Ligand binder design. Sequence first.
Ligand SMILES: Nc1ncnc2c1c(Cc1cccc3ccccc13)nn2CC1CCNCC1
Length: 448
Amino acid sequence: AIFSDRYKGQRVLGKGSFGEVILCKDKITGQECAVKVISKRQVKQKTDKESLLREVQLLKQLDHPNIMKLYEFFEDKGYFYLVGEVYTGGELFDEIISRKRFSEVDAARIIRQVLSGITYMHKNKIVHRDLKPENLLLESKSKDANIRIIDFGLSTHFEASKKMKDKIGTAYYIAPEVLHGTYDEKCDVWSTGVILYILLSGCPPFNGANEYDILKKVEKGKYTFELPQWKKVSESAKDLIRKMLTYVPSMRISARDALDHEWIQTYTKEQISVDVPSLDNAILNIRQFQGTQKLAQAALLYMGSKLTSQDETKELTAIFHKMDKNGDGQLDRAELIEGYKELMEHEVDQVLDAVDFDKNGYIEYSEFVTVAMDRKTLLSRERLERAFRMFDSDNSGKISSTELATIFGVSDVDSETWKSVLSEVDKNNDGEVDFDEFQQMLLKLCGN
Ligand SMILES: Nc1ncnc2c1c(Cc1cccc3ccccc13)nn2CC1CCNCC1
């Protein structure tokens, strides 16, 4: 059984953990689904194929409304294809940052869903390990929509990449016992407790200027409710957080018992019978937090994309050159289409639209190369601008040096490195950059 016999790719949904996620369609029934493609080359497996096959078969039999449904598994020489249900409501936090009000009740309802899914998976001896906001998808972009946890069980069978683009934000949520090697299902209670802490305060409990600093705080395991905005939170919420963030896992509360907690019982009642002051500073803080995480991620993806497009520009010109038997540097539509296929049609026609509107004759392939690549980088360049604009909440058009330190810290760009690049971009900078200057910094940070 081969993937492509059954499913056609329709559009890309993003990169997730361990590989690329594509919206696909059953060639017969028309059913839409999401497929995660895991490159055996790029991604090492942890276990034997028999363990993987067994766990997959188990996952297919399981069903819970807060757990992503897996439908099917395929393999060829180069890839694993994991087929499941597609959710269209986006990441939980990207929804939360658009709300005007957010109370403990809203936090409780979110966290009861997470604990419910986790409790069910732990019953089946499946551990997540990498539970974080990015793994909480909504069935629709609405405060009322159901949460689906994605990626349960993957970490048991696949080794995580050490590329920073892949691991942004991971440090905040990882259980200390995972850092040290001996872990079990209790690590997912810790990650949920970190998420709960963030929902209620807008700030991670273990925080720091870069990956090492954050991890050092997680390992020490010390955190407080020192911040001002913890005064607006019930002692009951805090009590559950203490139990979920208990250091020694055998002393840490279970997911089952966290569902039973007074706070969950009391605040997830259909009928709101308790006070619901909007946690206004927490929303402002969560927005700052999400914006920063998205801009750091976008920055890394932009630099990644500029390197990829550099190679591909070279390859494409080489390819067209071989095909250019005339040596006149002009090709027809047909030749351009095969050349672009060779690199790895409607995209060729969009390029020719710009290059020769009338299509009177042949195309300067050099002009085609530019447009092809100098457009194809759009999604990363516009996503970068969108993240910058979003981060810039006051519409100042600038990011301060303090904010750059944060953004780059999160991004593992060395402090002295980005300041040197800043100096090259603008000798007379005054501790702030506009979008173009920021983009100039990123180009210089990836050898451009
Ligand atoms: N189910 C989904 N629905 C929509 N988008 C998704 C996913 C999935 C998860 C997924 C898809 C297909 C198969 C799977 C098999 C095992 C585990 C997870 C799988 N990733 N993404 C992409 C978004 C992009 C924005 N950052 C959050 C993730």
